[PDB]
């Protein structure tokens, strides 16, 4: 037998960094969970117990903290690129570094309508993520995403005109609840290296903000014909706003809220136009995916 692929590294590295403005007293915090996996001329660690080719995963962890100390950790696209580039430059036999970063929210508190200089709240579990693949001779590939953005609209969602055959029980509807957990990813054009990533730094935070804004506005305002149709409208807009994005991918669960027939009880009317109380379903769920690019 033979090694066809191999990668190894450190996962679940939690990192916090504080920036303290000396003039104003204002502090800013960042918290992220980092994973770094390396590839290269490492097959002999597997086949011959040759540990000489292993940069210990503990050292990978140390490098993450040292890198965070010596560089900005924001935007995450930049931090991941710096981190990945370190490994392929430092170690001759390491040829790719794969860096995943999950950014956790720490939003500044407003106390008596005034932003507090050093107190923060986790407003929701929505994440901002990056996957950075730094490959020797092939530049830097970056996928940016938002995930865990949970939304619901109580009307202005329809689902009718679908295929009906002997496997079909679903009733057509012209008014339903629509709720999802948004996972949205945008894939950047390949970057030639760290200098090119650095040259585009302002685009990263701006594009994340745009992607979030477009997602929420489209979801809120579309009179939705389906999850499919609404997600395509989102992707189309994001591509239109940032030419350095090559593709946009959505993965959306359709989290079902079922009507509850209560007419068996004192003729109570709770369906159709009288539907007020619903049973949220934990499972199963629809899962709808799409990748949209430029034609
Ligand atoms: O959408 C449908 O319900 C449909 C479509 C073709 C034939 C039939 C039928 O024979 O009932 N029903
Ligand atoms: O087999 C079919 O054509 C079918 C299946 C479900 C509903 C209906 C219908 O409402 O006509 N028709
Ligand atoms: O027009 C139709 O699609 C139709 C009409 C009567 C019965 C059914 C059915 O059993 O699905 N479908
Ligand atoms: O990444 C960018 O979008 C960028 C970088 C440098 C200057 C400018 C600019 O002046 O718009 N924009
Ligand atoms: O090359 C650029 O960075 C650029 C070009 C046109 C507009 C903008 C901008 O508004 O940021 N940025
Ligand atoms: O700050 C900037 O200059 C900026 C922000 C978002 C997009 C762009 C761009 O596409 O040029 N530029
Ligand atoms: O928006 C929807 N898309 C679908 O594909 C689907 N299937 N059942 N309900 C659905 N709702
Ligand atoms: Lu029929
Ligand atoms: Lu610009």
UniProtKB/Swiss-Prot annotation:
Alphabetical list of InterPro entries matching this protein: Uricase (IPR002042), Uricase_CS (IPR019842)
N-acetylserine carried by residues: 1
Enzyme class label: oxidoreductase
Residues engaged in binding O2: 57, 254
Source domain of life: Eukaryota
Single GO biological process annotation from the record: urate catabolic process
Pfam families: Uricase
Keywords, alphabetical: Acetylation, Oxidoreductase, Peroxisome, Purine metabolism
Applications reported: Recombnant urate oxidase might be effective in reducing serum uric acid, and thus could be used to prevent and treat tumor lysis syndrome (TLS), a serious complication of malignancies that can result in renal failure or death in children with cancer.
GO cellular component term of the entry, any: peroxisome
Catalytically driven reaction(s): urate + O2 + H2O = 5-hydroxyisourate + H2O2
EC number: 1.7.3.3
Activity under varying temperature: Optimum temperature is 30 degrees Celsius.
Active site, renumbered: 10 (charge relay system), 57 (charge relay system), 256 (charge relay system)
GO MF entry, a single one: urate oxidase activity
Intracellular or extracellular location(s): Peroxisome
Activity control, per UniProt: 8-Azaxanthine is one of the most potent competitive inhibitors of uricase activity. Hypoxanthine has only a small inhibitor effect, and caffeine has no effect at all. Azide not only competes with dioxygen but also competes with the substrate for its enzymatic site.
PANTHER family reported in the protein's UniProt record: URICASE
Protein task: Urate oxidase is a cofactorless enzyme involved in the metabolism of purines. Catalyzes, in the presence of molecular oxygen, the hydroxylation of uric acid to metastable 5-hydroxyisourate (5-HIU) which is further degraded to allantoin.
Family the entry assigns: Belongs to the uricase family.
Subunit description: Homotetramer.
Protein name: Uricase
């Amino acid at each position: 037998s033979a090694v066809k692929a191999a990668r190894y590294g450190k996962d679940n590295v939690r990192v916090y960094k504080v920036h303290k403005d000396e003039k104003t007293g204002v502090q800013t915090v960042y918290e992220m969970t980092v994973c770094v996996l390396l590839e290269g001329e490492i097959e002999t660690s597997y086949t011959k117990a040759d540990n000489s080719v292993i940069v210990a995963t503990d050292s990978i962890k140390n490098t993450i903290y040292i890198t965070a100390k010596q560089n900005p950790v924001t935007p995450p696209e930049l931090f991941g690129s710096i981190l990945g580039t370190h490994f392929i430059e430092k170690y001759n036999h390491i040829h790719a570094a794969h860096v995943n970063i999950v950014c956790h929210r720490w939003t500044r508190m407003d106390i008596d309508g005034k932003p507090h200089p050093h107190s923060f709240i986790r407003d929701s579990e929505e994440k901002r993520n990056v996957q950075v693949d730094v490959v020797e001779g092939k530049g830097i590939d970056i996928k940016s995403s938002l995930s865990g953005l949970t939304v619901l609209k109580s009307t202005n969602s329809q689902f009718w005109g679908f295929l009906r055959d002997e496997y079909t029980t679903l009733k057509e509807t012209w008014d339903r609840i629509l709720s999802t957990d948004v996972d949205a990813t945008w894939q950047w054009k390949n970057f030639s290296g760290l200098q090119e990533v650095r040259s585009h730094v302002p685009k990263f935070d701006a594009t994340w903000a745009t992607a979030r804004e477009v997602t929420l506005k489209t979801f809120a305002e579309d009179n939705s014909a389906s999850v499919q149709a609404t997600m395509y409208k989102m992707a189309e807009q994001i591509l239109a706003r940032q030419q350095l994005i090559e593709t946009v991918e959505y993965s959306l669960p359709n989290k079902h809220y079922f009507e509850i027939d209560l007419s068996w009880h004192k003729g109570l009317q709770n369906t159709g136009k009288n539907a007020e109380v619903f049973a949220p379903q934990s499972d199963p769920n629809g899962l709808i995916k799409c990748t949209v690019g430029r034609s």
